[PDB]
């Protein structure tokens, strides 16, 4: 009823902030030999809680009206987070090949429920602002499959 996009977009850009951390915290991890289930668990811990936090965040906002003309636009927010989620898609996907890791399925389950509630969240909350995420998804969605997160990639829309 009234415009809420700019408590929104806060909330996709403190998340956007904590992905550029631990994504590529892992990736250094991966590239030096020193993923383990340790220093990924911490890092994937850390990215799972920021998620639940974003939903939250966001399912307790009211619901906007939009905007589609001022800075934070409908736009500005599904493409900030869309950049952010491929982040996190291709860097969880390329992690299932390190041989050191006992935990991955499990890391991802529990990542995926709270990636899940921020779309869900996000799509209420701005109505239809999950369209933009899922066509900027469109090849990056492979990555979501093969790290088994199926919540996330439905809630985005995929069949
Ligand atoms: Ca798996």
């Given at each position: 009823s009234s415009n809420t996009n700019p408590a929104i977009y806060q909330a996709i850009s403190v998340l956007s902030q904590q992905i550029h951390v631990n994504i590529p915290e892992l990736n250094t991890l991966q590239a030096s030999g020193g993923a383990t289930d340790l220093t990924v668990g911490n890092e994937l811990d850390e990215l799972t809680d920021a998620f639940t936090l974003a939903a939250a965040t966001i399912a307790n906002t009211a619901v906007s009206s939009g905007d589609?003309?001022?800075?934070?636009?409908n736009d500005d927010i599904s493409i900030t987070y869309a950049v952010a989620l491929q982040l996190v898609a291709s860097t969880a996907s390329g992690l299932?090949?390190?041989?050191?890791?006992?935990?991955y399925s499990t890391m991802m389950s529990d990542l995926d429920p709270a990636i899940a509630a921020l779309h869900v969240a996000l799509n209420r909350t701005?109505?239809?602002?999950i369209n933009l995420v899922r066509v900027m998804m469109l090849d990056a969605q492979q990555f979501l499959t093969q790290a088994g997160l199926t919540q996330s990639r439905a809630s985005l829309g995929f069949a």
């Open positions: 589609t003309t001022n800075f934070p636009t299932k090949q390190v041989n050191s890791l006992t935990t701005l109505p239809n602002s």
